[PDB]
Paper text:
Here we elucidate the molecular basis of high-affinity phosphite and hypophosphite acquisition by determining the ligand-binding affinity and structure of the PBPs of phosphite and hypophosphite [name] transporters from environmental microorganisms. The structures reveal that ligand specificity, measured here by thermophoresis, arises from a combination of steric considerations and the interaction between a ligand P-H hydrogen atom and an aromatic π system in the binding pocket.
Analysis of the conformational change between the open and closed, phosphite-bound structure of Ps_[name] using DynDom42 revealed that domain closure is induced by a ~60° rotation around an axis that lies between the two lobes. The positions of Y94, which hydrogen bonds to one of the phosphite oxygen atoms in the closed structure, and D16, which hydrogen bonds to and stabilises the capping tyrosine in the closed structure, move ~7 Å and ~4.5 Å (cα-cα), respectively, on ligand binding.
Author numbering: 2 to 260
Write the structure that this text describes.
Amino acid sequence: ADADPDVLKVALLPDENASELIKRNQPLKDYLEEHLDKKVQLIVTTDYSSMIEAMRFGRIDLAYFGPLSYVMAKSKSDIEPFAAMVIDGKPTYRSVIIANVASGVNEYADLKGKRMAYGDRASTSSHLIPKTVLLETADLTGGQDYEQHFVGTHDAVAVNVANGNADAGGLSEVIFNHAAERGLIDPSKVKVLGYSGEYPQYPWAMRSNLSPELKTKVRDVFVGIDDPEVLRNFKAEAFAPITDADYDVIRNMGSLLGL
């Protein structure tokens, strides 16, 4: 393994259409090349498990993980978290639970016997969080009291609810809120049922066998970002420093999934 590679392989959680993700992250790629003196190669894997496996086998250097996929990768490989974005004045985010207007689902209790869409099994806000909300508020258990279907991206959750393939679904609040704008769905076909509480934001992480000098530089460059052109694509105000213990809440909640 190379401690100080000339090219940095930088993976992005596949929570949306890969072209959308490459587009959104272009200004950050340009900023990193300038301030790190490295070439940057952006990667989007086919699913969450393939990004976790790429990290374990040393095939990527930096990764933008979700909270649950981060704690899963950290259990399998030697990695460290270093930054997360501050969006809307907070270092946290929420899941939204949505329903198709034609399904007969008017509240959480009405999901008994119906079809729920989740994203990836390793998703925080399109699986773990909404599943926990349905259990704690309505005493509903996935696969036992309702059908669960895993459709991949958060984009796919919104599409499958809106077109009638699912009756309800759970996903990231920010991703849902821009789905009509991007032309993914007709917003008249869906309604919001409710929201989760606030959970720690997606962490940036790197393989811990990079050199100490390179790891310090990566952390300093990200936390120092105040360029409006980089921040605007994310609707962010800053990149904040983080530690592994910030994700213990997710570890504890993950006991319900057998982690």
